[PDB]
Design a protein around this ligand. Sequence first.
Ligand SMILES: Nc1nc2c(ncn2[C@@H]2O[C@H](COP(=O)(O)OP(=O)(O)OP(=O)(O)O)[C@@H](O)[C@H]2O)c(=O)[nH]1
Ligand SMILES: Nc1ncnc2c1ncn2[C@@H]1O[C@H](COP(=O)(O)OP(=O)(O)CP(=O)(O)O)[C@@H](O)[C@H]1O
Ligand SMILES: Nc1nc2c(ncn2[C@@H]2O[C@H](COP(=O)(O)OP(=O)(O)O)[C@@H](O)[C@H]2O)c(=O)[nH]1
Ligand SMILES: COc1ccc2c(c1)NC(=O)CN2c1nc(Cl)nc2ccc(F)cc12
Ligand SMILES: [Ca+2]
Ligand SMILES: [Mg+2]
Ligand SMILES: [Mg+2]
Lengths: 427, 437, 328, 53
Amino acid sequence: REIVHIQAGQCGNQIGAKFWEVISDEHGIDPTGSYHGDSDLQLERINVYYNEATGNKYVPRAILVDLEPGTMDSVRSGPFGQIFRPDNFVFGQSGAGNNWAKGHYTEGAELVDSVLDVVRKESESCDCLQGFQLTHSLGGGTGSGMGTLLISKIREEYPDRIMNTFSVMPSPKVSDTVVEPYNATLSVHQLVENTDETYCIDNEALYDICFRTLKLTTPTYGDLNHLVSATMSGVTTCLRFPGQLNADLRKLAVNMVPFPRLHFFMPGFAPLTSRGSQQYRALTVPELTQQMFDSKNMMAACDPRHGRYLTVAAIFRGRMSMKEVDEQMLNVQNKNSSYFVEWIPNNVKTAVCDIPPRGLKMSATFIGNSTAIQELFKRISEQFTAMFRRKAFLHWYTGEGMDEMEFTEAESNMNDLVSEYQQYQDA
Amino acid sequence: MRECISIHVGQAGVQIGNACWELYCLEHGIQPDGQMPSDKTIGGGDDSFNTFFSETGAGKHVPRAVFVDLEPTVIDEVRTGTYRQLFHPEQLITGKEDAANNYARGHYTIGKEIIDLVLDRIRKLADQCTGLQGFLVFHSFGGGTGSGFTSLLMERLSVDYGKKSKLEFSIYPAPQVSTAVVEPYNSILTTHTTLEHSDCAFMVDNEAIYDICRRNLDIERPTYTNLNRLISQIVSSITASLRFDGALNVDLTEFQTNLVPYPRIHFPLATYAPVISAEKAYHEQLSVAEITNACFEPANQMVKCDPRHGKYMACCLLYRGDVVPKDVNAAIATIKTKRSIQFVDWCPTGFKVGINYQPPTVVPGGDLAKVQRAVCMLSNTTAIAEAWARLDHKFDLMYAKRAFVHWYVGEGMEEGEFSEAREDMAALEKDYEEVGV
Amino acid sequence: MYTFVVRDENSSVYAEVSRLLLATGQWKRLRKDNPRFNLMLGERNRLPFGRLGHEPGLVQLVNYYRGADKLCRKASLVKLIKTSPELSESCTWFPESYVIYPTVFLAAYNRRREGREGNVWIALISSEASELLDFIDEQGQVHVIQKYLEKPLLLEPGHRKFDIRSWVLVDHLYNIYLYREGVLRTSSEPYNSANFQDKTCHLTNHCIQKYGRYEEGNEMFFEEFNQYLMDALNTTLENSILLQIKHIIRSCLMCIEPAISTKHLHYQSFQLFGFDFMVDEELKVWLIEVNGAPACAQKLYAELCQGIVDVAISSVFPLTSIFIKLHH
Amino acid sequence: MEVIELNKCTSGQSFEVILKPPSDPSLEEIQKKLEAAEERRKYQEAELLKHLA
Ligand SMILES: Nc1nc2c(ncn2[C@@H]2O[C@H](COP(=O)(O)OP(=O)(O)OP(=O)(O)O)[C@@H](O)[C@H]2O)c(=O)[nH]1
Ligand SMILES: Nc1ncnc2c1ncn2[C@@H]1O[C@H](COP(=O)(O)OP(=O)(O)CP(=O)(O)O)[C@@H](O)[C@H]1O
Ligand SMILES: Nc1nc2c(ncn2[C@@H]2O[C@H](COP(=O)(O)OP(=O)(O)O)[C@@H](O)[C@H]2O)c(=O)[nH]1
Ligand SMILES: COc1ccc2c(c1)NC(=O)CN2c1nc(Cl)nc2ccc(F)cc12
Ligand SMILES: [Ca+2]
Ligand SMILES: [Mg+2]
Ligand SMILES: [Mg+2]
């Protein structure tokens, strides 16, 4: 069951690149593609993410896409840059100028077919293709506008494969330009329709976690992206490693998504760590469990106590008692049973994998489908209409073909989405 | 002699099938390559074990088994396991994409493309049978393959073999070892569509097996191999009469005759004692009366419920080991006084007893200790309807919001089959409650 | 922190159990349909016993005993007395009773006719059968009829009837706990023999007293009544009545222990019972009704509901005595 | 308590004990309903492809 990875634009390629570093280290694959690991657990499911090349080398099933040659050249120059199959670098030259319209309708249109061709070559190699996972941000133009255009086209060619994204939410605390709320509202409309699973990586939550909890006074994208690679390794654990679960994207979607549009997950991680500095006490299973449910460990700036958990998946990494995991997990439910819906019995599921991630002896990754994610979609809807009620900055988009109407629809679909999350917070 | 074909469906079906077939081989002295030293009718026989095995011109003993999983991972471990030589490649049928815990995906979408290939390898086995009795079908209620493909298979079998019996061993869904939140949808759906196609079904609630494994085996977090070795013990107990000399439950029709007076209410409760840990160095061997009494304790039942608050319509005691009729009747008489055993008025209060002198077999290096005598009670008590209420409540909770329904409709199914399957279940709980008040 | 739901909103008693429980700061009330409870203060009819004890990591306890109804329904209490050998068709503490449906009573009524002995009965009190048997069909449901106690013990001053309610608590371990405070529900109306249609003088129902003359709320607690026995009869409550009450409570609940014990069950029951007794003129105690959903008397609510919490609830979920353990 | 049908052999014995006396659809219909769900599927999928268009 192969997965096809796609990373698009400045942000999607920078986090895209860290993911492949991180998990290439966990599977003992080095920057040349040669395996040098200890456990067989590292290669039993290597094919989910890697293609096996002649000479028994491993090549990520990764398609790298940008409207600009900038970041993508930095990937090729990066530590694992040589691991990526070079034919899979697809890129224009004009850039997308942080403009959703250029990504989706003008500039991205030129380039999308060439991306769809590399996607096709990869899919055909595939034995049983589960689907796709995309890394992008919603606040610029390539990953946001072109990214969702790809997602639309992939779903037309492969209507019955799973579509998974890692979508970075914009935030005034980490913002390139003032049109990010416009770009993200337009994308969120796309995502509600055309993905099975999206992980809401909020840059607001990454920022606070960097500032308040890691005490980083002035956090770079590299600090934010350390958090993003930790969560990304986490949520993909039960797909890359052998365990009792041995999950795939579809079973994941079936059990997490009770209603098709409510497929926006809050990720969470524990222990929160800051790059380089390693602390030396491992956590106790009770600590992982309290921290991982802690709002301070959520990667989407939502208060879980303001919503109800529709469903929950939790993944524990390291040598530890599955008895104490069972006990610590049963205890946080029955302590805070108010915050889980009664009408999906037994909606918290847990898995364990022996291999911990690099640097830590024990770790807990949290995947929550909480109705409190509406707080995110409200935050962005507020910034959206704060400008749109004055039609501010709109010309950047009417200049590339778009109509005011298209904004009213996207705005409207998102307010609908927030109403839908609100319906089940009372049910 | 009349042959019986075993069909193992889904992960739960296949892994339990492995557990059983390995146990069978131990009990019948067959080896991992299918050579049975003790068989002297080489390349044939109408012995009693020949109901579950065929012989080969080269004297191999081959399960009358078909394994079928919508996905290759589990049946592959069979294809490469200690008993790889036992089975014949075309009896291990695997798909490529599984049902994703989706009743509708296993029944309609992926079911339709394999239902023919499967009924063909099945008929390839029915053709080496001189007088086929019918089928033993092993499956989970919860898995999409377990629930959805099984009811599509059950429907065709009723068609191609209208005269042969079909018995079920069904794993009922328990949250502790459960992988999916939609198991109650799949359970109701598959019960409704299988009800009139199954002659007798033995439910095994994973909750009950799990706690027997913790309590009586001192296993902290029971694995599937813990639960499956214990579950095949019970299965062996229930099938021994088909595979051994005897006069009770000699054919699959007797199971319906002895345990199923009304045809819908065909879910006999199984109780098993004694379950004794192999780590216990010093164990005092339990008596006929002690182990017959353990059959009326809920903590030994395959499903947790309270038979005191229901009524019986039938009862079998299946003993294995050092047991004589006199000890049984003294233990029955002693127990009758102290226990609350109420039959329906149209049924005689009384037990059909069966004794096999070969004591239970324990796979070397398992968790069960050898014991001098064991027993497995099969009782058709209305108190098992408790499990239907549990399952049906969980289903009403999700379905009131129509949570997850879209996954099903999106494969073909109609919201209607949901309420239709739930009304059958509502019929079923009313049937039970009639009989038991 | 333990958790508990509430499903009988009319429960005067567990209204108070709920109150006190919260005020420990170690108990939390969930929504009635929340399954993740430790403690079910349950409903009176169709309590869903088949759903208790299937929540991993949750020790579940409930405040009723599945099967207990057999002791708390007029018609089934009679069937229990005759069929259970432990009680025997001969027990000396139960009045003669028959179950007659409306679509051997007469036999014994005629052996009484042959002696012209008292032949009053109850449902509703008559003296001629035809008077009574025609009543049960006038309702349509099952009724039971019982030797009326023509010669009851009457307190003076007043020449007045009464019944005794003892509150009994059975815990998850099947210890039997009798509450030290009992209550006499007393009629303020001089029992008159010939006029058996004089309700309020024959039926000592607190409600039926729709009063207050001799005792507040036609209710006499144990200190008062023992003193009256001592003065008026030269005896004591223990000797003349209580010994026989503890024998009856013990006997009834020992009988049905195999049918309702939750000793090896996956969930657990406790339950509070109200036992109602009739003391005749010879100082003999009689069992009338066993009530499965009993209201306490206001003066004692504070005491009895705190004793439930100690003996039945904190025994299982930990955070001189007001009961007499009845030993078996 | 009445034993009733003691049958013995070398493997064991069997018998009853009375404590007290008393007081399908077609292959076509399968393929029809099945193929109705595959049409319901192809409809829903053609609407998706229509909307994408
Ligand atoms: N006792 C026991 N139960 C099992 C075993 N394997 C799976 N189960 C139960 O089966 C339920 C799910 O059904 P599965 O058989 O695993 O699913 P499936 O039949 O493979 O169908 P798919 O959805 O296509 O995977 C779970 O709730 C498990 O508790 C097993 O080996 N032993
Ligand atoms: N055999 C008998 N002889 C004499 N008096 C009797 C009697 N049986 C009952 N009584 C009296 O008549 C009353 C009959 O009413 P009954 O006992 O049914 O009310 P009750 O006990 O059901 C109310 P509660 O359920 O609240 O205790 C009894 O309470 C008692 O006062
Ligand atoms: N967490 C994180 N966010 C980023 C990173 N780079 C850009 N972003 C966010 O993405 C938005 C800009 O979109 P971007 O991807 O750079 O434009 P694009 O190249 O056209 O796709 C801004 O709001 C940033 O906050 C990164 O490395 N990490
Ligand atoms: C809430 O109910 C479920 C939630 C999630 C899942 C599931 C049921 N059952 C499945 O088969 C897929 N699966 C998971 N999938 C993936 Cl990719 N990672 C996981 C990590 C941890 C974990 F506990 C489950 C999963
Ligand atoms: Ca032979
Ligand atoms: Mg930028
Ligand atoms: Mg499977």
